PDB file of C-alpha atoms in Angstrom:
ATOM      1  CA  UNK N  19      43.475  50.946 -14.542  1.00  0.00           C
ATOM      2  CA  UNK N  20      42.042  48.513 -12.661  1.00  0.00           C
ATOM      3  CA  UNK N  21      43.204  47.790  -8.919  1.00  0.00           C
ATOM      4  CA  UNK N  22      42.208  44.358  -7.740  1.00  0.00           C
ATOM      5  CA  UNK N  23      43.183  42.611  -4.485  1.00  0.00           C
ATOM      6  CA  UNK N  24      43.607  38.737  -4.525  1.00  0.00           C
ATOM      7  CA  UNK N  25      43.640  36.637  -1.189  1.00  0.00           C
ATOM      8  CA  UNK N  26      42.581  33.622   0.611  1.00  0.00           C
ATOM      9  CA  UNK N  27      40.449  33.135   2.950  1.00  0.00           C
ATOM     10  CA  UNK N  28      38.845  30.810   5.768  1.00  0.00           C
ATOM     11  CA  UNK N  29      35.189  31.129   6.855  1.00  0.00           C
ATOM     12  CA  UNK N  30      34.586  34.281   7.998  1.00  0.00           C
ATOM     13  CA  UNK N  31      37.242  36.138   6.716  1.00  0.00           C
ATOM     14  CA  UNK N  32      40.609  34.667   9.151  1.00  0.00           C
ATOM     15  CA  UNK N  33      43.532  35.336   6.883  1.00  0.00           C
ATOM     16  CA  UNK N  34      46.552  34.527   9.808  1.00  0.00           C
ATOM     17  CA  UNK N  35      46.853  33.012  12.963  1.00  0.00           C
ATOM     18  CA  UNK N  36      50.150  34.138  15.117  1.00  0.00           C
ATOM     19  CA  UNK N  37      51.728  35.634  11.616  1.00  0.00           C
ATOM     20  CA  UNK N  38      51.121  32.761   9.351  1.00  0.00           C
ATOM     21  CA  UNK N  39      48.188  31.071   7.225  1.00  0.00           C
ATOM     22  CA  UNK N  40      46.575  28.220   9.057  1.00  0.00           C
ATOM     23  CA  UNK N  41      45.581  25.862   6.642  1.00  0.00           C
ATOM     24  CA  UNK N  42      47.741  23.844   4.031  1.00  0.00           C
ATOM     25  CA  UNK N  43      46.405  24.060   0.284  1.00  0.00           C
ATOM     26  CA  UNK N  44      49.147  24.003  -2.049  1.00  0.00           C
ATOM     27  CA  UNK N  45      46.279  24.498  -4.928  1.00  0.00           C
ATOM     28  CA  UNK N  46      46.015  28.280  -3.716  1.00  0.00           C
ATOM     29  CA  UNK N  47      49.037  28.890  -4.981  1.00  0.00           C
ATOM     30  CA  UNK N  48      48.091  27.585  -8.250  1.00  0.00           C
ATOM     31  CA  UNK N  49      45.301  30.036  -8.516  1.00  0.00           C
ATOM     32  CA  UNK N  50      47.143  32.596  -7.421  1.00  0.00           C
ATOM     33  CA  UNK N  51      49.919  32.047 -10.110  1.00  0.00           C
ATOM     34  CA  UNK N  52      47.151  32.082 -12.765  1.00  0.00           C
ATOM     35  CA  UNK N  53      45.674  34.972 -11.336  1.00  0.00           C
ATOM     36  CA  UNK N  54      48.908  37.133 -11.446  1.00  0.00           C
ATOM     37  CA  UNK N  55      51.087  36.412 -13.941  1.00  0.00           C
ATOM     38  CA  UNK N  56      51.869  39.195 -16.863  1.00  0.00           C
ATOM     39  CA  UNK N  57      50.290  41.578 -14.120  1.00  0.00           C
ATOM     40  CA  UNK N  58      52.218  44.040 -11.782  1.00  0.00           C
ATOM     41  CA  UNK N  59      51.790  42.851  -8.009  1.00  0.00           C
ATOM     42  CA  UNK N  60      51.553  45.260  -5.268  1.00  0.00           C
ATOM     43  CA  UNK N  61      52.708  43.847  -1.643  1.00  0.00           C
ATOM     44  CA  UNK N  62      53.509  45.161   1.575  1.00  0.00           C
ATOM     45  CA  UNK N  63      57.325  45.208   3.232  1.00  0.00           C
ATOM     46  CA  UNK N  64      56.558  42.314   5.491  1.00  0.00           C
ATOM     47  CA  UNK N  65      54.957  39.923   2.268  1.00  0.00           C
ATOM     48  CA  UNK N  66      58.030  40.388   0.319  1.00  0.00           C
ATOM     49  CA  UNK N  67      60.388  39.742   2.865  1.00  0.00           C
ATOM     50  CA  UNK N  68      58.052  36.107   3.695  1.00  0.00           C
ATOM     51  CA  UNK N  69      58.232  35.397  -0.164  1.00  0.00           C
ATOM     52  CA  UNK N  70      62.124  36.061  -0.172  1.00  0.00           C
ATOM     53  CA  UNK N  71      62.240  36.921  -3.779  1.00  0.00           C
ATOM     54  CA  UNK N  72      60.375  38.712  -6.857  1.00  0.00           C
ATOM     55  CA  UNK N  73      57.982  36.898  -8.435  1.00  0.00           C
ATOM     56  CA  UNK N  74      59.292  35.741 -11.724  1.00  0.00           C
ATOM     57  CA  UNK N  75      56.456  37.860 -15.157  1.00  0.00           C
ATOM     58  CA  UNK N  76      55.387  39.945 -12.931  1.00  0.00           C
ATOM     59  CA  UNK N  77      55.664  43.568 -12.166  1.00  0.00           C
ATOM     60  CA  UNK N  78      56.955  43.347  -8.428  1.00  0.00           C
ATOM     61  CA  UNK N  79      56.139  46.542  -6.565  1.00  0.00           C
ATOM     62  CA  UNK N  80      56.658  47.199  -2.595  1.00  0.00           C
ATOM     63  CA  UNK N  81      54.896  49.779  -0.671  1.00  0.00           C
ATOM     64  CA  UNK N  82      56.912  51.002   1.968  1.00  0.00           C
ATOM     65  CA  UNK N  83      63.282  55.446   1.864  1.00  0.00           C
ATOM     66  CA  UNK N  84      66.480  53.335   1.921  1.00  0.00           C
ATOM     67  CA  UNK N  85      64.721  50.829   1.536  1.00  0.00           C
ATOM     68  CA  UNK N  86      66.313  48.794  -1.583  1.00  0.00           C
ATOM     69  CA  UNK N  87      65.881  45.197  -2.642  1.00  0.00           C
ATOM     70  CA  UNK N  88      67.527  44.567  -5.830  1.00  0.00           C
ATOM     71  CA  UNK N  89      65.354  45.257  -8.744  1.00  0.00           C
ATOM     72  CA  UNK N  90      61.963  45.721  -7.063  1.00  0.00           C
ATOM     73  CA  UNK N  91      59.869  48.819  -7.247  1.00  0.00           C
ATOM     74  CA  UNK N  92      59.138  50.452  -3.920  1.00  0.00           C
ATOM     75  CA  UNK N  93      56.552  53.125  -3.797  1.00  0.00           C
ATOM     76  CA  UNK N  94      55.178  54.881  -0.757  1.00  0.00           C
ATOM     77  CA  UNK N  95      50.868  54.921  -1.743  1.00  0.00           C
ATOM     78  CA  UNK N  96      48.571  52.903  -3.562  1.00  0.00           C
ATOM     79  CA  UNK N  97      47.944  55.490  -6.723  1.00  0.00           C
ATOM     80  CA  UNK N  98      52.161  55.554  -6.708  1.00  0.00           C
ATOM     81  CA  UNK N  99      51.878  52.147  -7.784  1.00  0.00           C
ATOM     82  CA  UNK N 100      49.075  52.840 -10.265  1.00  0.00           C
ATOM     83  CA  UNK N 101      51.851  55.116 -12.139  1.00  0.00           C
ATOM     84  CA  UNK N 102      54.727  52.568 -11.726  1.00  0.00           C
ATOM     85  CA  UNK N 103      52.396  49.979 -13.499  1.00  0.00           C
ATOM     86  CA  UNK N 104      51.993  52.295 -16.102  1.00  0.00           C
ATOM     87  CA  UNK N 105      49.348  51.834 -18.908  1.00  0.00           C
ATOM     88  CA  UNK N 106      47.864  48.288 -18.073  1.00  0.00           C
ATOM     89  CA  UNK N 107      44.822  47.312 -17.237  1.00  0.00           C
ATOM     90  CA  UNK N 108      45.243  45.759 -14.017  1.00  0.00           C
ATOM     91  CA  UNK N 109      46.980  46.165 -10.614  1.00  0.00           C
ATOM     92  CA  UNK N 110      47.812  42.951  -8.144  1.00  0.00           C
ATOM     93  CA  UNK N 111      47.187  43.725  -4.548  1.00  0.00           C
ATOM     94  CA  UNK N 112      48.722  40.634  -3.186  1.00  0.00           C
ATOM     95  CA  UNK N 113      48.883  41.826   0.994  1.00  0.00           C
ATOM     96  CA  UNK N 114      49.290  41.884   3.321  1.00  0.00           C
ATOM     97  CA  UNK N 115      46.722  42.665   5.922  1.00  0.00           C
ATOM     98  CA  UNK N 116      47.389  46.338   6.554  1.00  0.00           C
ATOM     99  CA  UNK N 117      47.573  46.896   2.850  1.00  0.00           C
ATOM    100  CA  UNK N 118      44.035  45.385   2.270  1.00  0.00           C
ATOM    101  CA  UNK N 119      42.715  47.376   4.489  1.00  0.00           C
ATOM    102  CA  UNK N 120      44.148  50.104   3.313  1.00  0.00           C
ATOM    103  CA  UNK N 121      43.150  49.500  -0.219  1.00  0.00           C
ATOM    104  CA  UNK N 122      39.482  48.126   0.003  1.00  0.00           C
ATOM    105  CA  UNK N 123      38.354  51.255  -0.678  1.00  0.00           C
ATOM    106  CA  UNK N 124      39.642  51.669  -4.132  1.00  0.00           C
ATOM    107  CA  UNK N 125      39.494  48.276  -5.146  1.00  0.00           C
ATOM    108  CA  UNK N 126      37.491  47.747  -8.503  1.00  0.00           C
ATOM    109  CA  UNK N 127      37.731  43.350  -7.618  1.00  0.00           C
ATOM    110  CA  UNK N 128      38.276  40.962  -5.055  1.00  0.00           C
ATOM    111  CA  UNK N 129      39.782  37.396  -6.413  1.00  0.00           C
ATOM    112  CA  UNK N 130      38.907  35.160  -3.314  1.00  0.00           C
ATOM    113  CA  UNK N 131      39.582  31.772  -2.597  1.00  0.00           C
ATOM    114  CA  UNK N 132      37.476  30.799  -0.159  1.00  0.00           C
ATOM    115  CA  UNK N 133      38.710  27.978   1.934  1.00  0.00           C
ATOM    116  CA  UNK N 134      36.177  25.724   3.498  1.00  0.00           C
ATOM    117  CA  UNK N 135      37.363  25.910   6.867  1.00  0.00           C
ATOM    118  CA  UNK N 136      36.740  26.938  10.286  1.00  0.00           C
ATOM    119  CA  UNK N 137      39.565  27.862  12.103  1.00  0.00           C
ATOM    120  CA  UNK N 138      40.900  30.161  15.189  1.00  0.00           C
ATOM    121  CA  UNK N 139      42.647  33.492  14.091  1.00  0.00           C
ATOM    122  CA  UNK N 140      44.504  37.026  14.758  1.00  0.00           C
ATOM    123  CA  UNK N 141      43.988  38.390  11.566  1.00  0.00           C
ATOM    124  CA  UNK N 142      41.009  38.896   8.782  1.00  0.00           C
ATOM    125  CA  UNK N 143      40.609  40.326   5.056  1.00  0.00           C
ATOM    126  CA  UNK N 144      38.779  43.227   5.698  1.00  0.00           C
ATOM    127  CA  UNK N 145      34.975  43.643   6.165  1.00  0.00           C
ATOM    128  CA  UNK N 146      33.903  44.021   2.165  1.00  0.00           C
ATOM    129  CA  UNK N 147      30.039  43.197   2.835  1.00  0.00           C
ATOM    130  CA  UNK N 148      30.228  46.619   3.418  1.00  0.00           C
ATOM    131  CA  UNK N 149      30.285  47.794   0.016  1.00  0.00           C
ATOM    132  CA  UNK N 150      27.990  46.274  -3.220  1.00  0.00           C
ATOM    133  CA  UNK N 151      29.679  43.335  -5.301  1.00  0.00           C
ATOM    134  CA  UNK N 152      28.831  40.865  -8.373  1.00  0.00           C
ATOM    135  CA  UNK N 153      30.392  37.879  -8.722  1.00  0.00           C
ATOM    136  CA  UNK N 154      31.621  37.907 -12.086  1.00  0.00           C
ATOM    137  CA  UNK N 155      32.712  34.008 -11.827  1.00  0.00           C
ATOM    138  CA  UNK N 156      33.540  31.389  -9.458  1.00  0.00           C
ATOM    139  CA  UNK N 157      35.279  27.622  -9.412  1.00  0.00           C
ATOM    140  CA  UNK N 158      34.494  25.074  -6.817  1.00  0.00           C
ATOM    141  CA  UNK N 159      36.940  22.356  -6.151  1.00  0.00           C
ATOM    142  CA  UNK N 160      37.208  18.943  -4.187  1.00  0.00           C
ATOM    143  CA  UNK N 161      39.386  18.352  -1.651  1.00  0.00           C
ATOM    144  CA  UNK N 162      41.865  16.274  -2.851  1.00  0.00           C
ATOM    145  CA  UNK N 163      45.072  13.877  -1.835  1.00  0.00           C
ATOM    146  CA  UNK N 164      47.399  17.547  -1.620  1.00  0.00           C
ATOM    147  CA  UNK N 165      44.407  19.990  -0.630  1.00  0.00           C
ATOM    148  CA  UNK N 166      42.674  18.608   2.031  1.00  0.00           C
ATOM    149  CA  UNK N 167      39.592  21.451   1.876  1.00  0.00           C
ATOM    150  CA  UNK N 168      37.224  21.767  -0.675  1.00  0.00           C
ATOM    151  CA  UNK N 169      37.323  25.980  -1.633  1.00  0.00           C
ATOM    152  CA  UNK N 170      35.717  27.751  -3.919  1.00  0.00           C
ATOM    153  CA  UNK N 171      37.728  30.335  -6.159  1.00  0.00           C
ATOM    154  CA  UNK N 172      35.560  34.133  -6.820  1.00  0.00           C
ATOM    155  CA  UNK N 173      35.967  37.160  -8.859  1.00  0.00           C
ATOM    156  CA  UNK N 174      33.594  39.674  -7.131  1.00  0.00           C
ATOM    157  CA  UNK N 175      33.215  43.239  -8.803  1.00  0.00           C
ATOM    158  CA  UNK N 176      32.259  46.466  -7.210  1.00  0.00           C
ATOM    159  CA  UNK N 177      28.806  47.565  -8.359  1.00  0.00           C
TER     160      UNK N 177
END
């Protein structure tokens, strides 16, 4: 199986200011739906809880006892949620921060949408320069009268 992670990102990595995404860009969402759906998804406690829901067509799983949404799969590592996935091809790492971090390691691609954007923040998508990547594809896209950055959407994979 492939695990993937999918986020987005500012300049320079910022991924929250003061436990939120600082930057509107409903289009993210857009890619992200594309991105994920028919997959399994793989969040942390605090991400579910923000979204308030499972994702309808996908494969909802929470890393994390008692601990017991209605109809989600919890799981305690990362390879516990490559067996609850079962025989696919890919796994969803949709965040939060501590589980990128966490995960970097053992993930095969990155699907980042880079925002083009400067901003102030408390909390990056972890350092992956360190490691060797191709970029597989990309999408660039205008700012528009919703999205008011241009951002470019890439699928790096680990060489």
């Amino acid at each position: 199986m492939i695990v993937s992670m999918i986020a987005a990102l500012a300049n320079n990595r910022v991924i929250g200011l003061d436990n939120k995404m600082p930057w509107h860009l409903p289009a993210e969402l857009q890619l992200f739906k594309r991105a994920t759906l028919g997959k399994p998804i793989v969040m942390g406690r605090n991400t579910f809880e923000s979204i308030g829901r499972p994702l309808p067509g996908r494969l909802n799983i929470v890393l994390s006892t008692d601990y017991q949404p209605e109809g989600v799969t919890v799981v305690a590592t990362l390879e516990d949620a490559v067996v609850a996935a079962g025989d696919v091809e890919e796994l969803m790492i949709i965040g939060g921060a501590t589980i990128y971090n966490q995960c970097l390691a053992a993930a095969d691609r990155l699907y980042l949408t880079h925002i083009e954007l400067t901003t102030e923040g408390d909390t990056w998508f972890p350092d992956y320069e360190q490691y060797n990547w191709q970029e597989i594809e990309h999408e660039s896209y205008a700012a528009d009268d919703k999205n008011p950055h241009n951002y470019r959407f890439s699928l790096l994979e680990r060489v």
